[PDB]
Amino acid sequence: SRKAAAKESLCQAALGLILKEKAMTDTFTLQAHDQFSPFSSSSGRRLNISYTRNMTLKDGKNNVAIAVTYNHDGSYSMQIEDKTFQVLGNLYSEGDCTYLKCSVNGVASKAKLIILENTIYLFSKEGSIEIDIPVPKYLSSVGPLAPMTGTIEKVFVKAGDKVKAGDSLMVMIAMKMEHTIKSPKDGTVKKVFYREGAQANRHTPLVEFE
Amino acid sequence: YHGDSVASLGTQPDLGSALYQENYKQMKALVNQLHERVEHIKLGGGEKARALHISRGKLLPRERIDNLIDPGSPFLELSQFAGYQLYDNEEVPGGGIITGIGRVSGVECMIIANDATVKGGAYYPVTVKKQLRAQEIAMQNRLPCIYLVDSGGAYLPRQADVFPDRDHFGRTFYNQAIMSSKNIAQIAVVMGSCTAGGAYVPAMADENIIVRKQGTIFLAGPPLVKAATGEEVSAEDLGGADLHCRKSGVSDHWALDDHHALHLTRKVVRNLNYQKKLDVTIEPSEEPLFPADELYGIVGANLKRSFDVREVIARIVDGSRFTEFKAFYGDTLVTGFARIFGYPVGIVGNNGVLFSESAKKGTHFVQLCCQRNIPLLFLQNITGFMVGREYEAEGIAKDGAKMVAAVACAQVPKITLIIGGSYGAGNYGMCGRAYSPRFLYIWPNARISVMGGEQAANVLATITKDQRAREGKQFSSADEAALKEPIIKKFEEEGNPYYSSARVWDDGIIDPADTRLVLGLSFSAALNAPIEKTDFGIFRM
Amino acid sequence: YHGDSVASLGTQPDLGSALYQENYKQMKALVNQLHERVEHIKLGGGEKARALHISRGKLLPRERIDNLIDPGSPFLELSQFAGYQLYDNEEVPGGGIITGIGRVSGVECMIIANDATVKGGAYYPVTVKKQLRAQEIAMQNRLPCIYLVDSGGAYLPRQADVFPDRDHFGRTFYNQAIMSSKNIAQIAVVMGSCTAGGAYVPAMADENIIVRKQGTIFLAGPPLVKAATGEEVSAEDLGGADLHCRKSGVSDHWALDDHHALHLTRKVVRNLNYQKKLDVTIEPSEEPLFPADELYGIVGANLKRSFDVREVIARIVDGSRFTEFKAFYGDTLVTGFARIFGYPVGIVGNNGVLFSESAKKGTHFVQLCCQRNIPLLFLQNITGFMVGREYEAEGIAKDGAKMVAAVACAQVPKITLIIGGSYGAGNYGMCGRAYSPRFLYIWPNARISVMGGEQAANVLATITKDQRAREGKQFSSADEAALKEPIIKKFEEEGNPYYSSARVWDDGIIDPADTRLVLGLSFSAALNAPIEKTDFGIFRM
Amino acid sequence: YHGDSVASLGTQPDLGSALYQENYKQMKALVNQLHERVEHIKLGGGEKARALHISRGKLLPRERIDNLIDPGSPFLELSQFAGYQLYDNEEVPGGGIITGIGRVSGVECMIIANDATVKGGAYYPVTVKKQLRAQEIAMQNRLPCIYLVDSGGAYLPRQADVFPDRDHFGRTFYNQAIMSSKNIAQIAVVMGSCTAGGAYVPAMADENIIVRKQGTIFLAGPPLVKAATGEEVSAEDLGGADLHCRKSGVSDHWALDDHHALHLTRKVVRNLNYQKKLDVTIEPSEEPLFPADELYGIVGANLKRSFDVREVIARIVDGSRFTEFKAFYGDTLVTGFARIFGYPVGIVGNNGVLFSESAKKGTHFVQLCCQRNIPLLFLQNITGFMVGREYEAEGIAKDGAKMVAAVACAQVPKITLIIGGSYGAGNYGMCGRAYSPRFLYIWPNARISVMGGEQAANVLATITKDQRAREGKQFSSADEAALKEPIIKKFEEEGNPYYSSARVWDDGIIDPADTRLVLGLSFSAALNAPIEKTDFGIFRM
Ligand SMILES: CCC(=O)SCCNC(=O)CCNC(=O)[C@H](O)C(C)(C)COP(=O)(O)OP(=O)(O)OC[C@H]1O[C@@H](n2cnc3c(N)ncnc32)[C@H](O)[C@@H]1OP(=O)(O)O
Ligand SMILES: CCC(=O)SCCNC(=O)CCNC(=O)[C@H](O)C(C)(C)COP(=O)(O)OP(=O)(O)OC[C@H]1O[C@@H](n2cnc3c(N)ncnc32)[C@H](O)[C@@H]1OP(=O)(O)O
Ligand SMILES: CCC(=O)SCCNC(=O)CCNC(=O)[C@H](O)C(C)(C)COP(=O)(O)OP(=O)(O)OC[C@H]1O[C@@H](n2cnc3c(N)ncnc32)[C@H](O)[C@@H]1OP(=O)(O)O
Ligand SMILES: *C(=O)CCCC[C@@H]1SC[C@@H]2NC(=O)N[C@@H]21
Ligand SMILES: *C(=O)CCCC[C@@H]1SC[C@@H]2NC(=O)N[C@@H]21
Ligand SMILES: *C(=O)CCCC[C@@H]1SC[C@@H]2NC(=O)N[C@@H]21
């Protein structure tokens, strides 16, 4: 079965993600007119205070919160649950592969860093660990109303039915223009409010989900 | 060509000298005090209001700015010390508001975030002062402005000091109306509840964002409706996000929660069609050859002893290189050419009292910097302006007036940094606050008053001795000490960096070492605007 | 053609009605009180300091302005009521300074005269506020500026409130440096003794004048020389007129006495090569058909009763003619076209609360006035902004925001006059102080606050009744009266014309009748500048 | 930064649904019909005239444009369907002329080639219409213009419709005279025989090319010389290439044959000193995530059923990303921000009748696009403008007028595409032909008329029923059918894409799939000109 990641492995995943974001920043700068300028160094240098980034990584089924403090010398202090790790490292290339060079609490290591859509792959000489980046709700979300004031030609569904998203619920004609309603939502219909041949108005609810 | 070798500034200081140890210890004490004070100001309104802020699903405002800017980007906060002991029993951290410059989607944006944990996000007069300062920073530098609206409205007991004047609260909407006519994009993100005067801040935006079940806009609150009409209405039924996105049309984007609103903000900024163009010339950057804990040791805390300002310019420029202009004529002013982070800088600094030769050298250097379109960095360490009968006979007044005219007419991005004292009309000549620099930071040892405490105490002692000797009474040593303690005490208290930075007289007490990085950040924002041609007035010859 | 006949405004009021008698009596009482207060402010620092001012051969400052301007010319004083009960035991008449607009050698000049009879001519913070207001009036309107220097310097106990900020004393020299780069001529007449910060006011002038045995300029006084050096020197030996005209070269003309200095000032102004050019169109002037003691009877003192604003526009325009624009749609705002003294004016006035139809009508009219380059006169009589659930559902916020954006982006010469109340954000929509009008005068019945006293008292009464009913304690009538007396008292005291005009929030309480003449004078100065093209921002549709 | 992830549009349609099969089959039938019609138009004047064109050593005109442009370059032909059944028995393929945009020596040039195989290359009135359209496309977009002159002259029987008016034939020379004053280079290549009015087309060129024994220029032909004088002269002896290159001086380069003339044309274009500068910002390009045979299935042929316009915007933009502006307020108009081929586009599309909220949203979005200098792509699928008594009471007229004013005052490169119906005054609001877009293409299912056929038939049926019931006669079903068949028939015939594109009312019926590529090509040519600042008129609030 799959085994849980060690806290040091989560530090490596967090560091690889941070350095990948830096890489994107660096390749943006290479195309900029304003070259050599500050803001291009992903140092997290706040004025008079420190910056702590709170990120969450998903280890299998469970979420782990990692608080990453940006240190003045380029190191990171990553606190995972309670334990603080001193995390340093960088990226280097050998041919067409990218490697992540780490030092965590004085322990040096090297692993291949591949980030594909959401999953962070770390390939080392002791195994292979897959850490997932959680996807926020507003990127994964993708009842209905009447478009105008018209008469309904054909109903489709009743209570007790089930439709899946992108389904015909109703067709209504409003000043000679056939409008087929569809479902952005999902589930099971609890009530259909307008039977076929009745007059529905503008922004009037047609069906309902309980 | 750009290849030949050039001598550099800098002297390795005597690290074993007891003057170095005492200066280093006292400046380190000042910087540690600064550190612990800003770590107390960072928490905001305290743990009770932070619990009631996170119990409603709201991100805390520093977390909002952390999730808004590019990942790993440095944030330049402005005026972190506003409202510090400015009101009697009212502790207002940060003024109630968090303003700074950050990097959003590759664009340097100016961010204005209402901290709602401190007194409900209500507007104090210092909050309005800090906000209008941020908005003219955005207008001078052409920075797109982002507001994170979560206010409460003016602060009624103080309503006079907030409402009617020219630079009171309504000026804010003036600043959004003018900046929209100049293609400086204004985004408002309604994360809270702007009410009845603050509802113009989302309504005058070029592109707006609102949050469901959390963000309310109305010109009249439910107390005002229940008093004037008698109709009970809630907040979300009156001015909620569904009502404004769907029926009224005030909001332009709709957001599920706070993270969605900041994501949508980054989208709106990415589609602004803005491309940064530098008109100055850039060289590949370098580093100073001397560290800045040496600036702790060099500069120190006592203002009686002088130092060399060149040992500061060795510590903050690229390569420690410095082309000194007119180096022997009037060496109480040090003017030269350097580079910070690639940008060409004309550096003007002090070394003593200002003779007339120093003012002539300063006027010549400011004219060179405006003819070649080079920015100017002024470093203030002023005692005064060289008293004497002979010097007033020479016309020392018209030479200081020439420096003031050339400094005030200059169109290049000027940045002032007060590394020591800043007293009297020399403060006007070296581009103080009233002469519109881009940014004005101070060090934690600085003093700024109309004169020194000893000058005021001693001229008042001599004048009162002169009038009593015309009178005849005995003016003893104890009468002189009772005359000299409250003048010194008042000019010491009200000349502090914390007294000056509790208002928005300066853009923030900065660490000496961080000085280098801070100047680079400042200059980067100031190069977001094209440089206009300078035309001076009449030089009083 | 311009010959056909046109109907006119105006209704003859019921002069026998007891409402007219009571309104007339109460407004006459206000105007008589204004008269006696300004006759006390006119004397200045009192007879002792006036005797010691005339014992040195010096003209008194009002006599200086009387001998400076053209013979018989009207002088428009600005902010006569500054410093009125603004400091605790310190009575500062006129702020210490006399600023106004006059006609010198045929040119409208702006005159700034240091009254030396009031506290030695020392600069109070309100003196600096009044002076910087005068200087931006001169810069907006392109008026040549004349200073009659007879100061004493900052006021040390208040030195913080005078020295460091952006709009503190040093801004003055910024304003003379920028205005000299724009060909706005600056003349300083040293009639007194500017000292050590004020000596930049003569030194930064394009052409200077000094008086023998009476006028001293130095950057350092004889106390400072006697303290720093130990050399006893007088005032005339150190910085006298002979030393400055002959050796140092600070002064450009030399004057025997005060009359010679004012004569030389008129010569310097005559040789400025300035020729006034109007870009607006002028018609031959006329008169109102109704007198303005009728404005005493119409308007009165109570703000509860409304009146018609058209009966004001019949009393102040030429011929009582008024082309009313969009007269039925939203008649709580009255917008039309008239002429004062030949100048074309677009008149915007209030008649009640501001519905959304009123804001749309206002935005349309301001766009017409900027499209045709016509000046704008705003008349403020505001209660509020029409509370209700339906009106917030309609988007009343975005309509007020459209009026604020079009008012703030407008480049025509705008003049505000507050003929009644001016409360809240409607004050921002009708071009209050923060939106940069040219001039802003008020009538002696006006009130200006963030809300009315009754609004604040009643919403606080209803909110505290709401929270006690959630609590459970008894909130009686006597608790409500003890809740309602200090709110009403504070908003009545701090909403006064004398409280608002003790600061420089407004350019002066004017008589109602004199209103007509005053507006003409104001508009004449505002037409000394060419009119720029207006470009608005984004209209929130 | 530009690195974070963003949601995208698009829904995978139900490919098994019988609505999809029927819509796909009917749109595929329309596109195949378009294909075979343009393959018949491509051959030109037929094989007899093509044999007599190649027997004189002349390249055919499509081979001329194939050898003129860069190798492998896409050619964008404009108005391929002009003259389609426009004259009774006269079949005029392509109008007689071949106009388009191509890439010559790295420069986007506009090419105008006289097809001499169709009626001797004579000018029909539609040929003049097509040519003047091409020339204003070259002037709007600053494209250098190349003419391949091989005409015959006006078409005498139609001489009125060709000669005198403003936009008749002589306007051509006006267009070459104005464009030469603006540095838009005009090259004429005389490959044929321009005669007596067309001889101004080579003579007004900035640099000319002629072909020996093949190219003749004269202001008077040998019939006119033989009639007026009686001197027999040939064509080559009168106006040949040797006479014009050597004695008269009309031609500037001399060419052996057709390939030499096209080679010399490419040389002349290479030495124009033109360097393209983009002022917009570019991102690295991408692809849509959904194919466009899905646009066949989605859109279909019936105009009764609606579809979602967002499923079109998923199919034509880069990455299928689309920042939707004001997504809930008035969702009968879809406005958002996208990118095509790197270029930033502001996309405005329809979803139904236009309420007043839709017009306000449209006015706001067009102001944003002109404020940020972003191009605009309008997608037209209009039924009408929401009839009703309440909506006329609301002022639906002034909101449509605001959208028309902001669309007509806009200076950004606008491109219209009519993806469905386009009826009535909504056609004016969504930037139809009379509002000067850069390019206006249509799809083969579009309809364009002053109203729909059913609207005209039904309002005429109800009006005639109303007047007969005032009269008294019987208006039966058969009288109604005889009333409704010719109105429907006429509005169906004259609303076609082929009827609209037989004239130059649109720049060409395009395939749906090719739509994506075509828009990119169009926008590339439209970015050859710098973008001017937009200033709007008066917004009727
Ligand atoms: C008509 C022209 C204008 O626009 S002038 C309008 C003047 N402004 C107002 O009165 C708006 C009222 N402010 C508010 O938001 C209300 O107090 C409500 C909605 C009840 C605030 O709810 P809640 O989120 O629970 O408040 P909070 O915990 O953030 O309050 C923090 C503390 O500050 C206070 N506060 C807040 N706003 C004002 C204000 N405008 N004037 C005076 N005090 C204010 C609150 O009472 C609260 O006191 P405390 O710190 O909890 O003891
Ligand atoms: C470089 C920074 C700047 O530019 S601000 C520097 C601050 N200014 C000064 O201290 C200048 C000193 N002012 C003066 O003119 C001196 O007091 C002298 C020359 C003695 C005035 O002489 P005399 O003409 O007799 O005085 P006066 O009768 O006009 O004085 C009126 C009353 O006001 C007082 N006063 C005047 N100036 C100041 C001042 N700057 N700070 C504080 N008080 C001031 C005078 O003492 C005098 O008091 P009283 O009303 O007579 O009881
Ligand atoms: C003073 C202002 C002006 O410029 S008004 C002058 C009007 N223009 C003219 O009449 C020019 C005469 N056009 C021609 O080129 C002559 O017809 C000549 C030189 C004989 C054409 O020779 P060729 O090359 O053999 O002719 P083609 O085979 O290309 O002719 C094609 C068919 O079209 C006809 N055509 C041509 N031009 C005109 C014209 N302007 N008006 C009327 N018909 C014209 C030709 O007659 C010929 O007819 P068909 O198709 O062969 O049956
Ligand atoms: C002693 O107590 C200080 C006396 C005056 C201060 C000195 S004198 C020279 C410097 N210039 C100036 O105006 N003040 C400084
Ligand atoms: C009574 O005490 C006053 C209640 C509120 C004041 C009225 S309600 C309508 C006007 N608009 C506004 O905002 N205040 C005024
Ligand atoms: C039926 O034959 C059509 C009647 C009118 C056409 C409809 S009504 C609403 C749409 N708007 C418009 O002006 N015409 C369309």
CB A90 within 8 A of CB A101: yes
CB D497 within 8 A of CB D444: yes
Contacts of B151 (CB under 8 A, 6+ apart): B114, B116, B121, B122, B123, B192, B193, B194, B195, B198, B201
Task: Tell me how far apart the alpha carbons of residues C251 and C249 are, in angstroms, rounded to a whole number.
Answer: 6
Query: What are C437's two structure tokens?
Result: 């009008």
Closest C-alpha among D410, D371, B248, B177 to residue C402 = B177
CB C434 within 8 A of CB B174: yes
Write the DSSP string, A31-100: T-SSTT-TT-S-----SSS-EEEEEEEEETTEEEEEEEEEPTTS-EEEEETTEEEEEEEEEEEETTEEEE
Closest-CA distance, A41 to chain B, in angstroms, reads 7
CB contact under 8 A, A28 and D305: no
Task: Tell me how far apart the alpha carbons of residues C41 and C118 are, in angstroms, rounded to a whole number.
Answer: 11
Task: Tell me how far apart the alpha carbons of residues C158 and C96 are, in angstroms, rounded to a whole number.
Answer: 15
Query: What are C171's two structure tokens?
Result: 């801004």
* 3-state SS, residue C149: strand
Closest-CA distance, D402 to chain C, in angstroms, reads 10
Chain D contact for C402, CB < 8 A? yes
- Give the technique used to solve this structure: cryo-EM
Instruction: Read off φ and ψ for residue B412, nearest 5 degrees.
Output: -80, 160
Chain D contact for C538, CB < 8 A? yes
CB D238 within 8 A of CB D225: yes
Q: Give the up-direction half-sphere exposure of residue B407: CA atoms within 13 A in the CB hemisphere.
A: 34
Residue keyed to tokens 């961010």 = B111
* 3-state SS, residue D276: coil
Q: How far from each other are the two terminal CA atoms of chain D, in whole angstroms?
A: 40
Q: How many residues does chain C have?
A: 541
> Do the strands B107-114 and B97-104 form a parallel or antiparallel pair, or are they unpaired?
antiparallel
Please report, for residues B140, C333, C436, the alpha-carbon distance to residue C415 in angstroms, rounded to integers and kept in the order given. 27, 17, 9
- CA angle, D385 then D389 then D392, to 5°: 55
What stretches of B308-374 show up as alpha helix (H) in DSSP?
Answer: 310-316, 356-371
Task: Tell me how far apart the alpha carbons of residues C486 and C482 are, in angstroms, rounded to a whole number.
Answer: 8
List beta partners, residue C335: C325, C348
> Do the strands C216-218 and A207-209 form a parallel or antiparallel pair, or are they unpaired?
unpaired
CB B61 within 8 A of CB B146: no
Torsion region of C303: left, alpha or beta (phi above 0 gives left; psi -120 to 50 gives alpha): alpha
CB contact under 8 A, D541 and C368: no
Closest C-alpha among D11, D7, D9 to residue D297 = D11
CB B329 within 8 A of CB B359: no
What stretches of D197-270 show up as alpha helix (H) in DSSP?
Answer: 200-203, 222-228, 236-239, 241-243, 258-270
* Cβ-count burial C514-534 (b if 16+ within 10 Å, e if not): ebbbbbbbbbbbbbbbebeeb
Give the Cβ contact number of residue C64 at 10 Å: 24
Task: Tell me how far apart the alpha carbons of residues D249 and B426 are, in angstroms, rounded to a whole number.
Answer: 75
* Cβ-count burial D110-125 (b if 16+ within 10 Å, e if not): bbbbbbbbbbbbbbbb
The experimental resolution of this structure, in angstroms, equals 2.4
In B184-311, the DSSP E strands lie at 186-190, 193-195, 207-211, 216-218, 253-255
Query: What are D297's two structure tokens?
Result: 């299935």
Please report, for residues D114, D118, D256, the alpha-carbon distance to residue D50 in angstroms, rounded to integers and kept in the order given. 14, 9, 21
For the range C336-341, what are the long-range contacts, defined as Cβ-Cβ under 8 Å and sequence gap of 24 or more? C337/C374, C338/C313, C339/C283, C339/C285, C339/C286, C340/C316, C340/C377, C340/C516, C340/C519, C340/C520, C340/C523, C341/C285, C341/C520, C341/C523, C341/C524
D119 lines ligand 3 (CB under 6 A): yes
Q: Sort out which chain B residues have CB atoms less than 8 A from A38's CB and list them.
A: 74, 341, 517, 520-521, 524
Task: Tell me how far apart the alpha carbons of residues D335 and B278 are, in angstroms, rounded to a whole number.
Answer: 33
User: Which residue has its alpha carbon closest to ligand 1 atom 25?
Assistant: B120
**Interface list for B 197-216 with C (CB within 8 A):** 197, 199-200, 203-206
Best residue in A20, A48, A90 for a mutation probing chain B (most B CBs within 10 Å): A48
In B291-342, the DSSP E strands lie at 323-325, 333-340
> What DSSP character marks residue C509?
B
Closest-CA distance, B31 to chain A, in angstroms, reads 9
Closest C-alpha among D116, D112, D167, D169 to residue D144 = D112
* 3-state SS, residue D84: coil
Task: Tell me how far apart the alpha carbons of residues D38 and B246 are, in angstroms, rounded to a whole number.
Answer: 47
C152 lines ligand 2 (CB under 6 A): yes
Task: Tell me how far apart the alpha carbons of residues D517 and D287 are, in angstroms, rounded to a whole number.
Answer: 11
For the range A100-104, what are the long-range contacts, defined as Cβ-Cβ under 8 Å and sequence gap of 24 or more? A100/A12, A100/A15, A100/A16, A100/A19, A102/A11, A102/A12, A102/A15, A104/A8, A104/A11, A104/A12
Task: Tell me how far apart the alpha carbons of residues B406 and D34 are, in angstroms, rounded to a whole number.
Answer: 72
* AA letter at D143: L
Closest C-alpha among D136, D114, D133, D123 to residue D59 = D114
CB contact under 8 A, B206 and D368: yes
Strand order across the D97-104 sheet? D76-78, D97-104, D107-114, D145-149, D186-190, D207-211, D253-255
Contacts of C13 (CB under 8 A, 6+ apart): C20, C294, C297, C298, C311
Task: Tell me how far apart the alpha carbons of residues B177 and B205 are, in angstroms, rounded to a whole number.
Answer: 9
D171 burial via Cβ count (<10 Å: 0-12, 13-18, 19+): middle
D156 lines ligand 3 (CB under 6 A): yes
CB B194 within 8 A of CB B151: yes
Q: How many CB pairs under 8 A join B and D?
A: 59
Closest-CA distance, D2 to chain B, in angstroms, reads 5
Query: What are A128's two structure tokens?
Result: 């292979």
* 3-state SS, residue B26: helix
Query: What are C283's two structure tokens?
Result: 């018609």
- CA angle, A160 then A161 then A167, to 5°: 155
> Do the strands D153-154 and D193-195 form a parallel or antiparallel pair, or are they unpaired?
unpaired
Closest C-alpha among A206, A202, A151 to residue A182 = A206
Closest C-alpha among C218, C254, C210 to residue C238 = C218
Write the DSSP string, A174-192: SSS-EEEE--SS-B-EEEE
- What is the crossing angle of helices D258-270 and D61-68, to 10°? 40
C249 burial via Cβ count (<10 Å: 0-12, 13-18, 19+): middle
Closest C-alpha among B80, B221, B197 to residue B149 = B197
Please report, for residues C211, D275, D530, the alpha-carbon distance to residue D181 in angstroms, rounded to integers and kept in the order given. 64, 19, 17
Task: Tell me how far apart the alpha carbons of residues B427 and B425 are, in angstroms, rounded to a whole number.
Answer: 5
Closest C-alpha among D118, D131, D115, D119 to residue D60 = D115
Please report, for residues B147, B271, C96, D334, D375, the alpha-carbon distance to residue D324 in angstroms, rounded to integers and kept in the order given. 21, 11, 60, 8, 16
Instruction: Read off φ and ψ for residue C327, nearest 5 degrees.
Output: -75, -20
> Do the strands D333-340 and D323-325 form a parallel or antiparallel pair, or are they unpaired?
antiparallel
Instruction: Read off φ and ψ for residue C93, nearest 5 degrees.
Output: -70, 135
Q: Sort out which chain B residues have CB atoms less than 8 A from D344's CB and list them.
A: 271, 273
Task: Tell me how far apart the alpha carbons of residues A16 and A110 are, in angstroms, rounded to a whole number.
Answer: 11
D196 burial via Cβ count (<10 Å: 0-12, 13-18, 19+): middle
Residue keyed to tokens 């302006």 = B385
Write the DSSP string, D480-526: HHHHHHHHHHHHHHTTSHHHHHHTTSSS-B--TTTHHHHHHHHHHHH
CB C501 within 8 A of CB C82: yes
Write the DSSP string, D166-177: TTSTTHHHHHHH
Which helix (H) or strand (E) segment holds residue A194: the answer is none
CB D217 within 8 A of CB D200: no
Sign (positive or negative) of CA dihedral A178, A183, A188, A193: negative
- CA angle, B134 then B137 then B142, to 5°: 125
CB D185 within 8 A of CB D139: no
Which helix (H) or strand (E) segment holds residue D537: the answer is none
What stretches of D17-158 show up as alpha helix (H) in DSSP?
Answer: 18-43, 47-54, 61-68, 125-141
Query: What are C77's two structure tokens?
Result: 């004083």
Give the Cβ contact number of residue D276 at 10 Å: 11
CB B463 within 8 A of CB C223: yes
| Subunits with 3+ C-beta pairs closer than 8 A to B | A, C, D
Closest C-alpha among A148, A147, A162, A155 to residue A193 = A155
* 3-state SS, residue B176: helix
List beta partners, residue C189: C148, C209
> What DSSP character marks residue C333?
E
